[PDB]
Write a protein that binds this ligand. Structure first.
Ligand SMILES: C=CCN(C(=O)c1cc(Cl)cc(OCCCONC(=N)N)c1)C1CCCC1
Lengths: 11, 26, 249
């Protein structure tokens, strides 16, 4: 459902 | 100190579509 | 939000999305009160009956959004939390009394057309505006039905007399809450709902034309039931703890 966000943030 | 003033409305003197209902109730 | 409408772009530039890293999900609403401080409901972070206890690294705040699910490139900012502060006497065991938390962002956000903080009320805006029959505005990306919107929803709801709030529920209502919603006979509907928690209940001052946050979406019984009402944390009554936290840390 949610569009993936920059992995920069999921760090 | 600029709180509560919306760039795309208050700052341009434009009203959103329902805020009149708010103001009319006061 | 139930029985609301799609927000206009830029309509609520203080609206923040509380976002779970993994599984990547919408936790709650929240609001931007300065370039570094977000205000939300304590129960979004800490609710032991539901084994909910998130920490700083569990979490991302996304500011400037309109689309629920899209990553809105060049429009939204996504920030990491430095520190969550729950009210010390937040009452999760009984009635969600003092349902309020502050989150300090790791770095400040820059403002834009889509990102702008809301005012917190002073004694006198509170006294003047927080009155039965006066309408405020709630916003969020939560359920439309007691199913979820593509875009930020908005609904305007009247403040309800305190006795009517008390007589609508078995729950013990405190001075740190107020309730809002249409009565069964008034013939308009609307309520917050699941997913909307932590979001702003705001009013526009007729004196200086600013938007003030009077409430935080707290709790209800179901969503949009006749004879039931939404309850909100009374931000003004808890302002002293807000001032304290902010200028101690
Ligand atoms: C009678 C219901 C019991 N409780 C809940 O159902 C309840 C608990 C939590 Cl953490 C959140 C909640 O609602 C959050 C969604 C927003 O509120 N809903 C509505 N405005 N319709 C509702 C809360 C617990 C304490 C008082 C009510």
């Amino acid at each position: 459902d949610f569009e993936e966000i920059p992995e920069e943030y999921l760090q | 100190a600029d709180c509560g003033l919306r760039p795309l409305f208050e700052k341009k003197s434009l009203e959103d579509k329902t805020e009149r209902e708010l103001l009319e109730s006061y | 939000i139930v029985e609301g409408s799609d927000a206009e772009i830029g309509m609520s530039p203080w609206q923040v999305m509380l976002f779970r890293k993994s599984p990547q999900e919408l936790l709650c609403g929240a609001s931007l009160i300065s370039d570094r401080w977000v205000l939300t409901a304590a129960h979004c972070l800490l609710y032991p009956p539901w084994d909910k206890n998130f920490t700083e690294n569990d979490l991302l705040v996304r500011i400037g959004k309109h689309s629920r699910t899209r990553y809105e490139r060049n429009i939204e900012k996504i920030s990491m939390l430095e520190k969550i502060y729950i009210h010390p006497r937040y009452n999760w065991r009984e009635n969600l009394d003092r349902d309020i938390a502050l989150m300090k962002l790791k770095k400040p956000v820059a403002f834009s057309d889509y990102i702008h903080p809301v005012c917190l009320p002073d004694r006198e805006t509170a006294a003047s505006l927080l009155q039965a029959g006066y309408k405020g505005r709630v916003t969020g990306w939560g359920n439309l039905k007691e199913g979820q919107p593509s875009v930020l929803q908005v609904v305007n709801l009247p403040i309800v007399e305190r006795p009517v709030c008390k007589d609508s529920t078995r729950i013990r209502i405190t001075d740190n809450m107020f309730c809002a919603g249409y009565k069964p006979d008034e013939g308009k509907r609307g309520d917050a709902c699941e997913g909307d928690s932590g979001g702003p209940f705001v009013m526009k001052s007729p004196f200086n034309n600013r938007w003030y946050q009077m409430g935080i979406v707290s709790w209800g019984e179901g969503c949009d039931r006749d004879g039931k009402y939404g309850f909100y944390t009374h931000v003004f009554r808890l302002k002293k703890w807000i001032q304290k936290v902010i200028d101690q840390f």
